[PDB]
Design a protein around this ligand. Structure first.
Ligand SMILES: [K+]
Ligand SMILES: [Mg+2]
Ligand SMILES: [Mg+2]
Ligand SMILES: [Mg+2]
Ligand SMILES: [Mg+2]
Ligand SMILES: [Mg+2]
Ligand SMILES: [Mg+2]
Ligand SMILES: [Mg+2]
Ligand SMILES: [Mg+2]
Ligand SMILES: [Mg+2]
Ligand SMILES: [Mg+2]
Ligand SMILES: [Mg+2]
Ligand SMILES: [Mg+2]
Ligand SMILES: [Mg+2]
Ligand SMILES: [Mg+2]
Ligand SMILES: [Mg+2]
Ligand SMILES: [Mg+2]
Ligand SMILES: [Mg+2]
Ligand SMILES: [Mg+2]
Ligand SMILES: [Mg+2]
Ligand SMILES: [Mg+2]
Ligand SMILES: [Mg+2]
Ligand SMILES: [Mg+2]
Ligand SMILES: [Mg+2]
Ligand SMILES: [Mg+2]
Ligand SMILES: [Mg+2]
Ligand SMILES: [Mg+2]
Ligand SMILES: [Mg+2]
Ligand SMILES: [Mg+2]
Ligand SMILES: [Mg+2]
Ligand SMILES: [Mg+2]
Ligand SMILES: [Mg+2]
Ligand SMILES: [Mg+2]
Ligand SMILES: [Mg+2]
Lengths: 185, 53, 258, 144, 25
RNA sequence: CUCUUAAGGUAGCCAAAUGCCUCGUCAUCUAAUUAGUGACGCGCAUGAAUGGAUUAACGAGAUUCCCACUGUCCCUAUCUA
RNA sequence: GGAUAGUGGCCUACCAUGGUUUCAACGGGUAACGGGGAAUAAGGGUUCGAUUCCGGAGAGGGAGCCUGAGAAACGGCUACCACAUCCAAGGAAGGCAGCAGGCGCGCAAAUUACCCAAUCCUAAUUCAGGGAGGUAGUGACAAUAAAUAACGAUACAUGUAAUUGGAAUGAGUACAAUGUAAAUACCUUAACGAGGAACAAUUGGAGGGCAAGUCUGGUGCCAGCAGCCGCGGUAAUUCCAGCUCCAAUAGCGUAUAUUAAAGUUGUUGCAGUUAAAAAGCUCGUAGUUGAACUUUGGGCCCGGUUGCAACGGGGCCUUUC
RNA sequence: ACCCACUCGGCACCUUACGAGAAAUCAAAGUCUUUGGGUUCUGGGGGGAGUAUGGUCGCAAGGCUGAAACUUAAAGGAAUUG
RNA sequence: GAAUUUGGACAAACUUGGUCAUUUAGAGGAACUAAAAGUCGUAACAAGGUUUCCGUAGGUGAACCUGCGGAAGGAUCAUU
């Protein structure tokens, strides 16, 4: 048969199910960032644990060891490109000292809100879900998008999505067709 | 001794439900919980509480 | 298992074909031929994956059955003909000649060459043996037997093969200080000069190679191919000349394009 | 020393001693002896269908009361007779004598759960439909 | 019961079992 | 709890070559068993060198079953001196 | 010597008396095909691996053999055994552990669908064939992304109310067009398709562990719950319900197995006076382990890598290659 | 023979514990999470059970070896106040 | 050159016997466990009313009793 299809999990549940402080922190994050469920925090903490593991493996190696140099430079490049690691923290220890909010900030549901394109994070969530936001010449309907710090200058509405161009919408048309009658004629 | 298998469930009044507006399932429900819990609504009773009495 | 296998499952093909994983269940099994199963490169792979001329195996065989492709001077209409190292793939429609040589990553690099040097090819002398009637002969890396060889052509030497008469025009002798291609192992695709040969009677012959950048790597005699002297390769080398840059300087060369 | 060989060439003694002492572990000994296959009426399986034979009220162990309404079941697989608790308020009326019930473990891997003496199985389905889905009015038992 | 007398009773049981197994064949 | 003896049959063993009832009861053996065997035992009336219980080997001893084998029989016939 | 393609006790003839073994032979078990690998995992490990690749073996159980380069072949044959089809009773034909599909077994697993277009394979061969394979159907195995609403106005004290307004969209549906071998679906979209947006989210819980109720009704050591501790006996925060609340969420619970937790298998790394555990004592073979000592120390060079220094070499002398 | 001082080896003892331990206590039961001097034996919750079975030794009594099914949320140690 | 046919080696399979393994019936016997506030006594925990316990041996309805040697885990760290 055909070669197997590789697939991996993207999250990890907490070991203690009912830790009240962790529950309150997760709910704080979900309310601030408009998250659907705890699984999104789980996924971000899983990504952060993988990043931290790689950074720890590299930091245990000798400095100027070629593998450490190459792979740490690549990891730092990826993080600063995504905007999670700041511009002045390119040291592979700030990679260790990152946080969940540093990844939740680069979410498109957060960038759309912080760019004034939406009134709240939930407005941003529904606006991305409803195909209203385009990153480049490409509609992006996925809240978790991890803007590349260059798409930030390009996150605007689509030529579709009647907030940034041609069409007037769907319920506007029916309300016009019924306001024609409501006018009396 | 059988023939007593319903001495509570069967002989308990059949109170019906109460039709109420649906809950906003999902991200909306997470937002509802967040506002209910972390805007410091009057539910403290000294330190914290999540039910009346 | 009752006979010779005729199938080659994908993920069992030689990796240096860069074959897609989820294309199909099977790879083109190299038919019996000059070089080997693993060290070969089928004409279908080189026509549909290395040049994109054809899009399917059907189209590869369509190209092949009208005598367009030509391996070492002959037509080779076999869809899965096992072309390999130092082979000349000339096509007269889209007139151009390639020499199947190894890039420094260990794949069969697409290496356009001119007709004036595609006329011939190189061959590593696999063995020197007296044939019937006392006629000496040489067997080369590609499975060629050439009678009446030069009495000074020994094993591990390289011979320049006319490829139209199939005779020895010249021969380079294996010795310390000649240009050698590496045709197997970890260093598959590197080019360098022989520094020293460790003998190991009974065991395996080892050879220490120093590339242009003074990197010194050892490898088994089985997979080193003399290709001339330093700076005068008897053939044209591919775009990388077997230098084996490390990943860091490779990334540097890549980012030098902004 | 620590009562165990430390020498660089002591690996055989160390591993043989570990092999001998692993037999004092419940799980290792059970798995290597294959208890679940010979013993354990469920032949190392999670669930087993069986035919009810009798309704039974076993008086819960002290300090409790309230006899627990189990059923004697004869397993289709091997033929053994096991007592299975019928978990819910009521839910015995949905199981009939000489009726087919799916049985599952009682969560304790033997060593019967709770105050129900000698009862280590519970009923999950009857006549092909869930006991819980019969407690709730979602489905109803096939006629029999 | 005392462990010593438990052992004695068990030994008497073992003797009886040996005798029964001997009478049988 | 009684009456009572010198002591009240202990360890064992048993319808036993010792049990009346009795062809005892249960099991096994068989189609069928007053037979045999294994158990049970308030045992008419078992039992300790009047030796108790058991025992490999041995036995022209008593007994039951099985295989083999056969005129013992079904069912007789024939031949020789 | 025979036999084999060939080595070889592979077989035979004669001869010798050897070969393995506590460093575990031989025998027994495996609900054992081996490996690549998988789960879990601070490190060390524990467990699993029928199964996408490699190797092996088998085609109901054995055995034998034809052809052929290659089979001890089974969608080849021959025989026996067990099954089992047909029959005009004379006879004849079998082998799904290929693809579908049926029965049986079970806790436990899909369509008697389309196609050679791709991947490749086979032949005399560019054409034919391929249940190999691909495509679709079933499918909450597992995995990825993530709809169930968003924003205003009014009253009340940022939030409360079946007080109300304008937008947004896909879930669906559907001209076409793309996709496809022909489709389906996805992507893209004409028109339709939101107001208790009924286009209504569930699964488990609220004594502790463990997040969440001395709320109300019911039951009264009953019914039942409860992994464990326990709760139920007319005052139930634990059962049956209503309301409310908590957890995870298109998933959640239950059972079994296994991993971590387990430093409760301990090499790292356990414990043995009294909790389980030092043999009654000594000898002793294998095993494990076993005191110290032989060229050190000066000096001169060349040359590296990092920042004159540090660190690393290689070569000479010094009784020394 | 005794006295004094020293010394090696031995049965012990007293005080203090740096230290150890759950504590009782311990100059070893210390030099152990700062975990490795060598080495043998043994244990892995409580019962069932040192039972059944097989082997072996024994005249026998018994010794050595030695399970499982099943069952159970404690059993147990040291110490404190009653 | 077919039928047939001699002798070989390879040998399925069947019959009988042997042996091993795993399930399984069984009169009766003898245990264990659970439940049961049944009967009989009160053996242990206080010097538990005979200190307890270990090994061994014998006896007795039952716990247990007794002899011999041992232990303190004793109810004694103690008579220069
Ligand atoms: K109770
Ligand atoms: Mg008597
Ligand atoms: Mg009698
Ligand atoms: Mg008799
Ligand atoms: Mg008779
Ligand atoms: Mg006498
Ligand atoms: Mg007499
Ligand atoms: Mg005589
Ligand atoms: Mg020979
Ligand atoms: Mg395995
Ligand atoms: Mg197997
Ligand atoms: Mg496998
Ligand atoms: Mg299997
Ligand atoms: Mg395979
Ligand atoms: Mg085969
Ligand atoms: Mg079959
Ligand atoms: Mg065959
Ligand atoms: Mg078949
Ligand atoms: Mg086949
Ligand atoms: Mg099939
Ligand atoms: Mg819904
Ligand atoms: Mg859609
Ligand atoms: Mg409730
Ligand atoms: Mg709580
Ligand atoms: Mg322990
Ligand atoms: Mg004790
Ligand atoms: Mg002890
Ligand atoms: Mg020794
Ligand atoms: Mg030494
Ligand atoms: Mg134990
Ligand atoms: Mg105590
Ligand atoms: Mg007393
Ligand atoms: Mg006393
Ligand atoms: Mg007294």
């Amino acid at each position: 048969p055909r070669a197997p299809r590789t697939y991996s999990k993207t999250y990890s549940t907490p070991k203690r199910p009912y830790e009240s402080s962790r529950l309150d922190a997760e709910l704080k994050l979900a309310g601030e960032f408009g998250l659907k469920n705890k699984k999104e925090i789980y996924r971000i903490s899983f990504q952060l644990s993988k990043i931290r593991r790689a950074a720890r493996d590299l930091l245990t190696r000798d400095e100027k060891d070629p593998k450490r140099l190459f792979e740490g430079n690549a990891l730092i490049r990826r993080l600063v490109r995504v905007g999670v690691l700041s511009e002045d923290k390119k040291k592979l220890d700030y990679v260790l000292a990152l946080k969940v909010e540093d990844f939740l900030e680069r979410r498109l549901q957060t960038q759309v809100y912080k760019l004034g394109l939406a009134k709240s994070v939930h407005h941003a969530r529904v606006l991305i879900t409803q195909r209203h936001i385009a990153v480049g010449k490409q509609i992006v309907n996925i809240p978790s998008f991890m803007v590349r710090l260059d798409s930030e200058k390009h996150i605007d509405f689509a030529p579709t999505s009647p907030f940034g161009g041609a069409r007037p919408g769907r319920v506007a048309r029916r309300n016009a067709a019924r306001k024609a009658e409501a006018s009396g004629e | 001794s059988l023939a007593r298998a319903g001495k509570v469930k069967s002989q308990t009044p059949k109170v019906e439900k109460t039709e109420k507006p649906k809950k906003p399932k999902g991200r909306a429900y997470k937002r509802l919980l967040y506002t209910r819990r972390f805007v410091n609504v009057t539910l403290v009773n000294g330190k914290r509480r999540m039910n009346p009495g | 298992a009752r006979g010779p296998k005729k199938h080659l499952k994908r993920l069992a093909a030689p990796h240096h074909w860069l074959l897609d994983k989820l294309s199909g269940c099977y790879a083109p099994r190299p038919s019996a031929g000059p070089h080997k199963l693993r060290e070969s490169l089928p004409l279908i792979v080189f026509l549909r994956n290395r040049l994109k001329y054809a899009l399917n195996g059907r189209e590869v065989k369509a190209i092949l059955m009208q005598r367009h492709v030509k391996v070492d001077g002959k037509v080779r209409t076999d869809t899965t003909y096992p072309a390999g190292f130092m082979d000349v793939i000339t096509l007269d429609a889209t007139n151009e000649n390639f020499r199947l040589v190894y890039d420094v990553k260990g794949r069969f690099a697409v290496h356009r060459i001119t007709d004036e040097e595609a006329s011939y090819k190189l061959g590593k002398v696999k063995k020197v043996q007296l044939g019937k009637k006392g006629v000496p002969y040489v067997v080369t890396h590609d499975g060629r037997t050439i009678r009446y060889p030069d009495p000074n052509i020994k094993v591990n030497d390289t011979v320049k093969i006319d490829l139209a008469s199939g005779k020895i025009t010249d021969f380079i002798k294996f010795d310390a200080g000649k240009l050698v291609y590496v045709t197997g192992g970890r260093n598959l695709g590197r080019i360098g000069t022989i520094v020293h040969k460790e003998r190991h009677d009974g065991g395996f012959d080892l050879v220490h190679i120093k590339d242009s950048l003074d990197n010194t790597f050892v490898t088994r005699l089985n997979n080193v191919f003399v290709i001339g002297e330093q700076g005068k390769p008897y053939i044209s080398l591919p775009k990388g000349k077997g230098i084996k840059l490390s990943i860091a300087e490779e990334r540097d060369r890549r980012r030098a394009q902004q | 020393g620590k009562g165990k060989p430390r020498g660089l060439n002591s690996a055989r003694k160390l591993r043989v001693h570990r092999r001998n002492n692993r037999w004092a572990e419940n799980n290792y000994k059970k798995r290597l002896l294959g208890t679940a296959f010979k013993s354990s009426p469920f032949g190392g399986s999670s669930h087993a269908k069986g035919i009810v034979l009798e309704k039974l009220g076993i008086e819960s162990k002290q300090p409790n009361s309230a006899i627990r309404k189990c059923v004697r079941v004869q397993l289709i697989k091997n033929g053994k007779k096991v007592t299975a608790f019928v978990p819910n308020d009521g839910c015995l009326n949905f199981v009939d004598e000489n009726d087919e019930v799916l049985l599952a473990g009682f969560g304790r891997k033997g060593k019967a759960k709770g105050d129900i003496p000698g009862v280590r199985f519970k009923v999950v389905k009857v006549s092909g439909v869930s006991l819980l889905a019969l407690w709730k009015e979602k489905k109803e038992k096939p006629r029999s | 019961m005392r462990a010593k007398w438990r052992k004695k009773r068990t030994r008497r049981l073992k003797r009886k079992r040996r005798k029964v197994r001997a009478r049988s064949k």
